[PDB]
A paper describes a structure:
A central part of the bacterial flagellar motor is the MS-ring, which is composed entirely of multiple copies of the [name] subunit. Major functions of this ring are to support the assembly of the switch and to stabilize the assembled motor. Starting at the N-terminus, each [name] protomer begins with a predicted transmembrane helix, TM1, followed by a set of domains termed ring-building motifs (RBMs). From the N-terminus, these include RBM1, [name], and RBM3, with RBM3 further divided into RBM3a, a ß-collar, and RBM3b.
All structures have an [name] ring positioned just beneath the RBM3 ring, with this ring termed RBM2inner. As in previous reports, we observe more than one stoichiometry for the RBM2inner ring; here, we observe 21- and 22-mers. The resolutions of these RBM2inner densities are 4.1 Å and 3.7 Å, respectively. The density begins at Gln-125 and ends at Gly-227. Although our model for RBM2inner appeared similar to the previous structure at a global level, the RMS deviation was 1.2 Å for Cα atoms, which is higher than anticipated at this resolution. The main positional differences were found in a long loop (residues Leu-180 to Gln-190) between secondary structural elements and at the termini. However, the overlay had a high RMS deviation throughout. One possibility is this high RMS deviation reflects the ability of [name] to adjust to different MS-ring diameters and symmetries. We also observed additional densities on the periphery of RBM2inner ring. We observe 11 regions of density, which we tentatively assign as an RBM2outer-RBM1 complex.
Residue numbers in the entry:
A (entry chain H), B (entry chain G), C (entry chain F), D (entry chain E), E (entry chain D), F (entry chain C), ...: 125 to 160, 171 to 227
């Protein structure tokens, strides 16, 4: 049963990575899921010379926070390829 | 049993993706289902030089929110191929 | 048992799609069933240069809402091949 | 058991379709049964240049509403090959 | 058991159809039985240029309403080959 | 057991048909039995140019109503080869 | 057991038919037994130009009413080869 | 057991028929037994030109009423080869 | 067990018939036993030109009434080869 | 067990017959035993021109009444080869 | 067990017959035993021209009444080869 | 067990007969034992021209009454080869 | 067990006979044992011309009464080869 | 077990006989044991011309009364080869 | 077990006999053991011309009374080869 | 089960190490997980001549603290390739 | 078990005999053990011309009374090869 | 299970040793884990001519105290390759 | 178990004998153990011309009384090769 | 289980010995563990011409007292290759 | 189990003997263990011309009294090769 | 289990002997363990011309008293190769 659960989690991770790669100016990303108020970690590798709107960074936030049950939109930690802690709501300091 | 459930979910995802592709100015899309007040994530790849009405974007919203049980019309997150967080009801800020 | 249920649902979907295709100015459609106050989604692909009466759009609504148990006539979401959210009763805004 | 029930329902559907085809100016029809106050859907394809009486449209209504147990005569939805929602009792608006 | 019941019902239907065909000016008919106050549906194909008495149409009514247990004489719906809802007692309007 | 019962009923039907055929001016008849106050249906094919007494039509009535248990003499519906509802006691109108 | 009972009843019927045939001016008859106040049906084929006494018609009545247990002498229905309802006690009208 | 009983009854019938045949002016007779106040039926075929005393007709009555248990002497129905209901005690009218 | 009983009864009948044949002016007789106040039936075939005393007819009566348990001397019915109901005690009328 | 009893009874009968034959002027006799106040039947065939004393007829009576348990000396019925009911005590009339 | 008992009784009978034969003027005798106040039967065949004392006839009586348990000396019935009921104590009349 | 008992009794009888034969003027005797106050029977065959004392006839009495348990000296019945009931104590009359 | 007991008794008898034979003027004797106040029987065959003392006849009495348990010295019955009832204590008359 | 006991008793008897033979003027003796106040029997065969003391006859008495448990010295019966009842204590008369 | 006990007793007897033989002027002796206040029997065969002290006859007494459990020194009966009852304590008369 | 858990932990460690390596100026790192307020240890090997922001060091902290359930952001210990205890919140001294 | 005990006792006897033989002026002795206040018997064969002290005769007494459990020093009976009852404590008279 | 635990502990030890070796100026170290307030022992072999900060010695302390559950930062004992007890908090003297 | 105990006792005896032989002026001894206040027997064979101290005779006493559990030093009986009861404490008289 | 524990203890001993050997001026040492306030024994073989600080002897003490659970730092006994009881805290005298 | 215990005791004895032999001026010794306040026996064979201190005789005492559990130092009995009861504490007289 | 314990004890003994041999001026020693306040025995063989400090004799005492659980430092008995009871604390006299 645990093997089935971990395989399902890995397949979800692969599908999510493929979909977020299918976003235009992104060659690849790396998503990891955390299941206990859950949370998730996104490490986007943004393509150089490209920058999407805040309304589309929230698009990435809600894209990853929606397709998984119980993930609040404010619990996704978004980090680019070199620093750039964009989620100021988590790190409110 | 869990394998049957996941296969049924994947088949539903494939059928829904095919139907939403069968919408004219869309080559392909990517739907993911979230089952616990459920919710779903749609990442449409709109064809360039095409733009459908708001009454037909709500058509996509209700098309994905209807064919699955218990999905409210206000819980679908719609994102185009490059940002464009169209669903302002979820992100009411 | 679940396989039998899903096969029966798929066969019903295929038969319904064939019957709604057998309506004159329609080459093909795509029906999906939602079973919990149930609801259903219809994505008709109307033939160009053809337009049926409102009393025959309600014919499609009742045709899909009747042959399945417990589906109210006001819960069918009807969308043409390009937008055109015809069901104003669901989207009363 | 469920397979026996669905096969019996399909055989009833085929027999009913053959009998309603055996009505003169009809090449073929499409009946679907709904079992929970049940109801049924009839999509007649009337032959061009032919039109039967109201007392014989009620003949079709009672022909389909009688040979199945518990189907009230006012719950049959009758639609021709192109719109023409004839049953005004269901759609009393 | 259900297969035995359905085979017995089909054999009764065939025998009844043969007997009602054995009535003179009738090449063939189509009877269907409904078992829950039961009821039945008769679709007679009367031979052209022939018309039997009302006391012999009631002969058909009682012929089909008698050989089956519990069928009241007023619950048989009689329809000719083209409309002609003869049973005015059911459709008392 | 049900097969034995139906075979016994069919054999009784065949024997009764042979005996009623063995009545002189009758080439063949068709009897059907109804078992729940039971009743039965007789469709005699009287030979042309022949007509038996009322005291011998009651002979047919009691001949079919006697050889089967519990069948009252007033419950037999007698119909000739073309209409002629002779049993006025059932149809007292 | 039921097969044994029906075979015994058929053998009794055959023996009774042979004995009543062994009565002089009778080539053959047809007896049927009814078992629930039981009753029986006799269809004698009297030889032309022959007529037995009333005290010997009652001989036939008691001959068939005696050799079977519990059959009252007044419950036998006697019919000749063409009408002739002789038993006026049953049909006292 | 029932087969043994019926075979014993048939053997008794055969023996009784042989003994009553062994009575002089009788070529053959036909006895049938009725077992529930029981009763029996005798159909003697008296030889022409012969007639035995009443004290020897009562001999036949008691001969058949004695060799079987519980048969009263007044319950035997005696009929010759052509009518002649001799037992006036049963038919006291 | 029943077969043993019937074989014993038949052997007793044969022995009794042989003994009563061994009585001088008797070529053969026919005895039948009745077992429930029992009774028995004797059909003697007296040799012509011979007649035994009443004290030896009572010899036959007691000969058959003694060798079987519980048979009273007044319950034996004695009949010659042609009528002649000798036992006036049974038929006291 | 019943076969053993009947064989023992038959052997007793044979031995008794042989002993009573061993009495001088008797070629053969025929004894039958009756077992419920029991009784027995003796049919002696006395040799012609011979007659034994009454004190030796009582010898036969006690010879048959003694060698069997419980048989009273007054219950033996003695009959010669032609009538001659010698036992006047049984037939005291 | 019953076979053992009857064989023992027969062996006792044979031995007793041999011993009573071993008495001088007796070629053979015939003893039978009766077991329920028991009793026994002796049929002596006395040699002609020989006659033993009364004190030796009582010798025979006690010889047969002693070697068997419970047989009183007054219950033995003694009969010669031709009548001669010697035991006047049993037949005290 | 019963066979063992009867064989032991027969062996005792043989031994006793041999011993009583071993008494001088006796060629052979015949003893029989009776076991329920028991008793026994002795049939001595005294040699002609020999006569033993009364004190030695009592020797025979006590010789047979001693070697068997419970046999009183007054219950032995002594009979010579021709009558001669010597035991006057048993027959005290 | 009974066979063992009887064999032991017979062996005791043989040994006792041998010992009493081993007494001088005795060629052979015959002892029999009686076991229920028991008793025994001795039949000595004294050699002619020899006579032992009374104190040695009591020697024989005590020799046989001692080697067996529970045999009183006054219960041994002593008889010579020809009468001579020596034990006057038993026969005290 | 009983065989073991009897073999042990016989071996004791043989050993005792050998020891008493081993006494000088004795060629052989015969001892028998009696086991219920037990007792024993000794039949010594004293050698002619020899006579042992009374204190050595008591030696024999105590020799046989000691080596067996529970045998009192006054219960041994001593008899020579010809009478000579030496034990006057047992026979104190 | 009993065989083991008797073999042990016999071995003890043999050993004791050998030891008492090993006493000088004794060629052989014969000891027998009695086990219920037990006792024992010694039959010494003293060598001629030899006589041991009383303090050594008591040596034999205690030698046999000691090596066996529970044997009192006053219960040993000592007898020489010819009478000589030495133990005056047992025979204190 | 424990092997499955440790393999899952090792796979998580490998994936996390690969992702943190996929951060630009990092050739490799070494993560270890601690599961009981849990905690974790990170030993980054920063590439020479590179230094990321504090808002991206907190990016590493939250990247490792998010993808694992229940890890607070203040419990991650971050150490470079040579000392440099950057996390001053843990070591608040 | 009893065989083991007797073998152990015999081995103890052999060892004790060997040790007491190993005493100088003794070629062999004979010890027997008595086990219920137990006791033992010693029959020493002292070598001629040798005599040990009383303090060494008590040495033999205690040597045999010590090596066996529970044997009191005053219960050993010591006898030389010819009388000489040395133990005056046992025989204190 | 214990083998699995010890193998897991050894693998953790090996991984920790490899990671601490991966720290620059360290060729190898030796870690041992202690599991009951747990504690651990570190024996670092610092490379000559190298010395890291106190804030990086605390880096080693927290690196080993973090990756294992429940290890407080003050319970790690740190010793270089030659003495140098650096942890003054444990050894506070 | 008993065999193991006796073998252990014999091995202890052999070892003790070897050790006491290993004492200088002793070629061999003989020890026997007595186990119920236990006791033991020692039969030393002292070498001629040798005599050890009393403090070394007590050495032998304690040497044998110590190596076995529960043996008091005052319960060892010491005897030389010819009398010499040295232990005056046991024999305190 | 005990074998697993002892093997684990031996492996810990070997690893600890190797680590303490890996301390510079030590060729080999010998550690033994004591498990019940536990304790341990260290026998260091210090290399000649080398002497570490007291703060590094306490390093050895805590190195061995830390890597094993529950060992207090004051319970380790430290001894060099030749005496030199360094731990004065244990031996506080 | 007992065999294991005795083998362990023997191995302990052998090891102790070897160690006490390894004491310089001792070629061999003999130790025996006594287990119930236990005790032990030592028989030292001191080498001639050698004598150890009292503080080293107590060394032997404590050497044997220590390596075995529960042996008090005052319960060891020490004896040289020829007398010399050194332990005056045990033999305090 | 006991074999495992004894093997573990022997292995501990061997290891301890090897370690104490590894002490410089010692070629070999002999340690024995005593397990019930336990105790132990050490027999050191000190090398000639060598003498370690008292603080290193206490080193040996604590070296053997530490590596075994529960052994107090004052319960070790230390003896050199020739007397020299060094432990004055045990022998405080």
């Amino acid at each position: 049963q645990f093997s089935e659960q971990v395989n399902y989690q890995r397949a979800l991770e692969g599908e999510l990575a493929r979909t977020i790669e299918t976003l235009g100016p992104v060659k690849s990303a790396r998503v990891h899921l955390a299941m206990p108020s859950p949370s998730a970690s996104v490490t986007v590798t943004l393509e150089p010379g490209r920058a999407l709107d805040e309304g589309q960074i929230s698009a990435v936030v809600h894209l990853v926070s929606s397709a998984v049950a119980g993930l609040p939109p404010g619990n996704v930690t978004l980090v680019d390829q070199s620093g750039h802690l964009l989620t100021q709501s988590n790190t409110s300091g």
